[PDB]
Design a protein around this ligand. Structure first.
Ligand code: PDY
Ligand code: PDY
Ligand code: PDY
Ligand code: PDY
Ligand code: PDY
Ligand code: PDY
Ligand code: PDY
Ligand code: PDY
Lengths: 287, 277, 276, 273
């Protein structure tokens, strides 16, 4: 019930971890680097920010969310001096099994099934449900930020990267309590996009000639123009399509909420959803 | 066309046997029974210190008064009391007690699903009038729904306009924001309670505040088991988290469960047991 | 890729036989007929005193003209008139009358729900083009829906961009209301189409009430044989909460607008009523 | 030189037996007793939602804590609770009850004037420390004066710093209203001590009688109570804030400074109370 708060360490991180001058330099350059504990040889990941207001917010919000085990665990935070400047060094449990879609795509010809889609969506949404229950919107939930702990077949999938996260707030109706300004609802848009990609292998909005954002692509996003083409959507439920339809709603306030998402039959009873085979792994493997 | 509000300036005791000590509780913010001098018939008195809010309250409540589902104001006095200018509102006396406490005093016949609907239809009548003239009540809770008398044929009325606001300042949007919609939230909560006997959100011992914010609530068994998905869906539309997703009072009033109370089954509810106990 | 608006600055009478009387008329917001001099072919003229709002309209109308369900601008002129700079707009001449004028020059042949559907899809096509290039018309009423001619294959076009606005400054749309009232308008027009009078109407502070409140029914006789699928669709377009309203994409993908040849040919009181 | 405040970050439950039945209660204002895990010794717990207001309280209170007439802060935790961030303040447990709570239980006529003086000296010493480090408590009311133990000479202590403000950022002092609030309150309290009811009350015009500063020293109650005291009270209760004496002037007031020399006449306080 009561959760310990963030103690940012001030000692040098190289005390506790074999950090090189090499990786450390890729770190400020945004790279996320694998480093090793020196007591144990256990491996971890290091993300490096320059101590600034935004960086502080990231660490604080991520620290809160770390309680939930579908979110990547922060082991320690350092505030050290590097290149004269002061910066935050975040050490996480190392997620080593790769990005969500990489796993799926490199696995043939073991089909991905709709049921694996549902299980995967059930656990992302659990993470989002936790974040919204404490008034954080992640606001950057994309495939690049969902990684598997290990290649182990039972690896668990975790949400990463909180540099866009925001506190959603500083007979009584809910709005009466806090601002309604809607960052929580784009986490919901994002679930929609991931769910969509999981069932077919490609996103609902895309570029043809590819692959940067198209002006065509932006219009289609803004219009809300997408379809459920054959061959890849033909065995998928109408119930699943309707669910994607509610999440990809253009009007944010028309969008389903995480509580409604989690109570949806398809999410709530993954283990009952058919193991209908999908084109996801082929489409994905085909790049 | 209805009459404007005329605040009477002469001392209220010119006209009502008002104790000086009723006046003393009156100031604390108590509604008090008082009597006419000619008629010797009983009325209700609440007292406000004259200020912009009180002026707003009398003003909005007065306009609302045309609706008979709203407690009637007999007249309004502006008197000096304890040195200050302050507002004295005389109302019809609502002698029936509050919505629930009535419902829990019971045992003869069964409080049925149909009684719930008829009740929700009349609170809805009140709300629909308010909103149609661009006032939002904003404090529609049970303690503000009183029965006229103790007769079975008592008529339920809405009270306390201390939080009311004008929502006003072709597509309907070209001709307000979020005030009207919490009246509908409230209708949701009240309707929920009318059907089972407890509220949809509650403290079991910040959880409750979270559950409201997330919109986590059940339709638990046993007591919700006889209620249809139609009624469930209507409550779901009202308890919507995002205000703009909520039903408007016009849609509510045109919902078949409300519009056709007649046609709704007199199936027994657990409301009265739960409430008593 | 299509060309930009090149506003001509030469005297318009160099090109069209425009009389001083029509210029005077056209100054008063009347739309007038003129003729090319090379060709003697027929056109429509409307005159705005040049000002930033007049400039907005021309700029937006030009953009939308790309789409053939929008009246075509053929030339824009900036000339002096009464010593004031002003804009003269030459459009394709729409000669088939207003949408509802044609329907009520019918009886007593049927006007069916299916034809209703098709007309609606037609207007919808205009609105879809606008929105997708971020323009809201904001004046979609019946008298801005004129037909090209009275030939059987005349097309219905949207006119009058005097209230038009740019709606504009794994990523949500709200990142990359005007449009939503266009859609309230589709509902009004659709509602009228299916029965022959408006959903809200004069009876005026009382009518502003009925609008704000959403107060309208689907009375009989006239709505009795009309399909529930339609009534639901109107119910969404006419929603009081704008964000609750359906979008133009969602409108064009609706089975009633999409698959017309499975909306029944059920006859409507529309022409009979429009007449009376 | 005393140590600064070292807000701990580990679960408060690593150290104390904070049954989750207390959190949700303590989180809305209740002060709950808890126990140190290793010593089982009991303590009190106050929980604030972590904000600048809250952080101000802990800091000012930590500073006041060196004065043994302020309740002592044992330590302060910062923890996530229900995903919100909040400060957990662990104090020495004051288990003797509210100052007046005890005086009630006195036997009619037992509580003396000499006692009242000794108490006011005692409350007085707290105010004096606060003001001398530029803190004004601003909520010195009876329910914030609690007794340590129940022992006969258990020491009385000022609690609750939720309203405390720093009264600041040949020379004249002014060249360097909040403290004067504290001195009014010593006045009301001193008054209650001597008769058993306040100078302002109802049987409201009570907001006029304060503004007008109209109160009496009614008999039978006030009849044998000295005049130098009545006069002390009349300064403190001055309507005009600048007219009130300071805490230094109060600590040097003979009735305060030399309680020894003040006679033990009985008051109707207990009975009345
Ligand atoms: C030799 C490869 O070195 C590795 C090995 C494993 C990781 N793990 C990982 C990586 C690659 C990482 N990459 C983030 C980069 C930014 C987008 N989201 C993914 N973030 C996290 C957070 C916790 N671990 N983790 C990173 C680098
Ligand atoms: C039937 C539609 O087929 C298409 C046609 C084109 C694309 N384009 C494309 C594809 C195939 C795509 N695939 C990503 C899916 C998620 C993993 N990374 C690859 N991502 C993007 C981003 C912008 N476009 N784009 C995708 C699917
Ligand atoms: C013994 C007579 O005491 C009475 C008798 C009847 C009433 N009636 C009543 C009462 C008790 C009353 N109470 C409000 C108090 C504040 C909460 N909402 C209800 N408001 C109104 C408005 C019109 N009447 N009425 C009040 C007191
Ligand atoms: C049996 C369902 O579980 C619960 C759980 C908690 C409660 N709580 C409770 C109950 C029973 C309750 N009941 C009142 C509802 C309004 C009319 N008078 C009774 N009001 C409130 C407000 C906050 N909680 N709370 C009641 C039932
Ligand atoms: C005798 C010729 O008179 C005509 C003949 C045809 C037209 N055509 C027409 C007319 C009558 C016209 N009238 C607008 C007037 C303002 C309301 N919206 C319709 N607007 C347009 C735009 C393109 N053509 N067109 C106008 C006048
Ligand atoms: C069954 C209700 O019948 C009525 C009664 C009155 C009206 N009023 C009216 C009617 C009948 C009406 N009829 C047509 C005028 C020509 C364009 N389409 C609508 N237009 C307007 C515009 C403003 N009001 N109004 C409409 C329908
Ligand atoms: C639940 C156990 O019962 C106790 C036993 C002792 C306490 N002690 C106490 C209590 C009751 C307490 N109560 C505050 C409540 C708010 C008014 N000021 C006094 N404040 C303090 C500060 C230091 N201790 N202490 C509180 C509760
Ligand atoms: C000789 C006058 O005797 C009275 C008569 C009435 C009062 N009223 C009253 C009394 C007796 C009073 N007594 C409390 C004093 C503080 C300790 N708890 C008891 N407190 C308050 C607060 C507001 N009024 N009020 C006090 C004294």
């Amino acid at each position: 019930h009561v959760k310990s708060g963030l103690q940012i360490k001030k000692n040098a991180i190289i005390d506790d971890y074999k950090v090189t001058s090499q990786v450390l330099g890729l770190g400020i350059n945004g790279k996320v680097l694998q480093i090793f504990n020196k007591r144990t040889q256990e491996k971890f990941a290091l993300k490096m920010l320059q101590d600034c207001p935004k960086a502080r917010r990231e660490v604080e919000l991520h620290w809160r969310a770390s309680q939930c085990p579908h979110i990547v665990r922060i082991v320690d935070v350092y505030e050290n001096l590097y290149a004269g400047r002061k910066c935050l060094l975040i050490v996480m449990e190392c997620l080593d099994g790769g990005e969500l879609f990489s796993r799926i795509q490199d696995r043939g010809d073991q089909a991905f099934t709709e049921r694996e889609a549902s299980e995967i969506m059930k656990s992302i949404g659990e993470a989002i449900q936790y974040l919204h229950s404490i008034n954080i919107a992640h606001r950057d939930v994309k495939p690049e930020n969902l990684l598997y702990t290990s290649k182990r077949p039972n690896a668990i999938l975790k949400l990463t990267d909180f540099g866009f996260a925001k506190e959603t707030t500083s007979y009584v109706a809910p709005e009466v309590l806090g601002p309604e300004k809607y960052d929580k609802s784009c986490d919901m848009w994002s679930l929609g996009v991931i769910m969509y990609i999981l069932l077919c292998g490609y996103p609902p909005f895309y570029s043809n000639h590819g692959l940067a954002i198209s002006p065509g692509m932006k219009t289609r996003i803004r219009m809300g123009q997408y379809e459920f083409p054959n061959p890849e959507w033909s065995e998928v439920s109408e119930e699943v399509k309707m669910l994607i339809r509610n999440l990809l709603k253009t009007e944010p306030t028309q969008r389903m909420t995480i509580t409604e998402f989690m109570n949806h039959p398809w999410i709530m009873q993954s283990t009952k959803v058919p193991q209908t085979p999908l084109h996801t792994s082929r489409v994905l493997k085909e790049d």
